Amino acid sequence: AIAPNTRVLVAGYGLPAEFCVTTLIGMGVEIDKIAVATHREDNRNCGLHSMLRLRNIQFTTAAANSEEFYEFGANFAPDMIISMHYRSLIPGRFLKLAKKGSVNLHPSLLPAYRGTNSVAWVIINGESETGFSYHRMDENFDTGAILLQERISVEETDTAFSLFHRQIARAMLRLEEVILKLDQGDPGFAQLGEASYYARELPFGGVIDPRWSEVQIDRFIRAMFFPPFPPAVLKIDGKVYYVPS
Amino acid sequence: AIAPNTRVLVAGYGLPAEFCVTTLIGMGVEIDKIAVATHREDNRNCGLHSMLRLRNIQFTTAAANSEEFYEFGANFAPDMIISMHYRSLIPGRFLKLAKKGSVNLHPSLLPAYRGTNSVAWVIINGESETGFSYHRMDENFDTGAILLQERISVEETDTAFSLFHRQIARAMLRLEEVILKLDQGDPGFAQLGEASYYARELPFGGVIDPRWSEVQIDRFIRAMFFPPFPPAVLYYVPSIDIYR
Numbered sequence: 001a002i003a004p005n006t007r008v009l010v011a012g013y014g015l016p017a018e019f020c021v022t023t024l025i026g027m028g029v030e031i032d033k034i035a036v037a038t039h040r041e042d043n044r045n046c047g048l049h050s051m052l053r054l055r056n057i058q059f060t061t062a063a064a065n066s067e068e069f070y071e072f073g074a075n076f077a078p079d080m081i082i083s084m085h086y087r088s089l090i091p092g093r094f095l096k097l098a099k100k101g102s103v104n105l106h107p108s109l110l111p112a113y114r115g116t117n118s119v120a121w122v123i124i125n126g127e128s129e130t131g132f133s134y135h136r137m138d139e140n141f142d143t144g145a146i147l148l149q150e151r152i153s154v155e156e157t158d159t160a161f162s163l164f165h166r167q168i169a170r171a172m173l174r175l176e177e178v179i180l181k182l183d184q185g186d187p188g189f190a191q192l193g194e195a196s197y198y199a200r201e202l203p204f205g206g207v208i209d210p211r212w213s214e215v216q217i218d219r220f221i222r223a224m225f226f227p228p229f230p231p232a233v234l235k236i237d238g239k240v241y242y243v244p245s
Numbered sequence: 246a247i248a249p250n251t252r253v254l255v256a257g258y259g260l261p262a263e264f265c266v267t268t269l270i271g272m273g274v275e276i277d278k279i280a281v282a283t284h285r286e287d288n289r290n291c292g293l294h295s296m297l298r299l300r301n302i303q304f305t306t307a308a309a310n311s312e313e314f315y316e317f318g319a320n321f322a323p324d325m326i327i328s329m330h331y332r333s334l335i336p337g338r339f340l341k342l343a344k345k346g347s348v349n350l351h352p353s354l355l356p357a358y359r360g361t362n363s364v365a366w367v368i369i370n371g372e373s374e375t376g377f378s379y380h381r382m383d384e385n386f387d388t389g390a391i392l393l394q395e396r397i398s399v400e401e402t403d404t405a406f407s408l409f410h411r412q413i414a415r416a417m418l419r420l421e422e423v424i425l426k427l428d429q430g431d432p433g434f435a436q437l438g439e440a441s442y443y444a445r446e447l448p449f450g451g452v453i454d455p456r457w458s459e460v461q462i463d464r465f466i467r468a469m470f471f472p473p474f475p476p477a478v479l480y481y482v483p484s485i486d487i488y489r
């Protein structure tokens with residue numbers, strides 16, 4: 001069991017954050033010992049936002065770099081911070097508020113696929129294996145010590161869509177164990193191997209390079225499939241076509 | 246892996262439904278092979294509705310006993326139906342649409358704690374263990390064949406609140422397995438054991454009887470604890486700590 005009176009601050013967004021809050025409640029963390037930092041109510045965040053209002057869990061939507069956010073953290077005085085698809089870089093001083101530190105879920109086997117769009121890139125690059133990494137947060141993205149990783153096979157029929165959702169689902173299986181590792185002061189291990197990096201931008205601006213091989217085009221089309229967003233674009237005779245995927 | 250082109254209708258509500266759709270998408274079920282029947286958008290169902298809108302997943306909020314609900318299922322032609330906290334009785338003729346049948350998640354070890362508010366009665370009644378049952382649905386609530394059960398210990402500090410949430414979390418962790426049972430035509434097993442049934446309201450209109458033992462009082466307090474609902478009353482008593 002988690003230490004009694006453990007104070008947990010969840011920074012997050014959407015279903016993973018809703019699930020994390022559910023998990024914490026299920027672990028017996030009291031409502032007054034849960035706080036959430038999230039973003040302004042969205043499509044993807046209606047679930048979380050309504051849950052927080054309904055249960056009277058304190059929350060902020062202040063920007064991560066704002067004073068209000070820092071005060072929210074400070075007044076709460078978390079023991080631990082759990083980032084569950086929180087979009088923004090969390091300032092180091094906010095992290096320092098939690099003397100048991102923090103954990104964040106990243107959908108790659110770090111230090112591979114640092115950056116964003118990790119699911120799309122894994123597919124673009126023809127990986128047959130990827131995974132997720134619950135890792136302590138340091139002041140930069142994607143760099144902190146690994147608390148838990150798990151491998152996820154990439155199938156030749158996976159899309160960014162299917163892999164993204166499997167990533168979430170599979171990662172949720174491990175969440176309770178991760179919270180316990182935090183609870184118990186598991187230092188985790190410094191990330192190992194060579195880091196790869198991918199830019200915030202949509203891969204190749206969503207545009208198929210005609211010089212790619214068919215295998216690379218197939219991968220890219222899959223990597224680009226993510227309803228409701230536009231699919232991969234093919235330009236022909238100066239004109240845009242969305243692929244059927 | 247789930248059979249290609251399997252068509253899945255999720256009848257559900259709130260996070261368990263959202264998690265189910267997420268699980269399906271991860272399993273490679275395409276959006277046009279998912280349909281959702283749910284209830285209106287509300288404070289416990291907006292996450293699901295937002296997902297359905299964002300991903301353009303076809304859905305209905307028609308009442309379970311309505312022609313519109315039936316026509317939604319018939320049009321979609323599910324292979325399987327997954328009920329994830331769907332409140333209402335799904336009519337037999339709707340279940341009949343899915344050749345691979347259905348499963349529903351019920352937060353007890355069926356046939357114990359049929360009915361509603363199972364988590365609160367589990368605590369009131371002093372159970373030391375409970376669990377969840379993924380069971381095929383027949384025409385009645387809570388009576389169909391068991392596909393999967395998992396036991397959950399009920400701790401001395403558990404409240405209706407914590408147990409309700411742990412039920413969901415733990416049950417979600419078995420969902421993928423259950424969907425694959427459905428896919429594979431696992432017949433499950435006929436329910437066996439001591440049936441019980443509890444409905445709706447906890448007794449005593451939330452009122453602590455000082456004749457009860459401290460063990461009874463503590464259980465009642467914990468069973469009544471479920472933000473944002475009022476707690477047990479003696480004046481409002483949200484913990485035994487406060488009670489003493």
Ligand SMILES: Nc1nc2c(ncn2[C@@H]2O[C@H](CO)[C@@H](O)[C@H]2O)c(=O)[nH]1
Nearest residue numbers: 086087088089114115116141142200
């Ligand atoms: N995880 C991760 N996210 C990033 C990185 N760079 C940018 N982002 C995300 O995309 C936004 C940049 O506009 C940030 O707020 C992050 O949400 C990175 O290196 N790692």
Ligand SMILES: C[C@@H]1CNc2nc(N)[nH]c(=O)c2N1
Nearest residue numbers: 088089090137139140141142
């Ligand atoms: C994805 C998350 C969100 N924000 C983070 N903030 C810091 N500081 N460090 C991080 O690693 C992360 N990753």
Ligand SMILES: C[C@@H]1CNc2nc(N)[nH]c(=O)c2N1
Nearest residue numbers: 333334335382384385386387
């Ligand atoms: C809880 C769920 C919701 N609806 C059901 N409908 C039928 N027919 N059979 C059922 O068992 C159930 N249980």
Ligand SMILES: [Cl-]
Nearest residue numbers: 353354375376
């Ligand atoms: Cl039970």
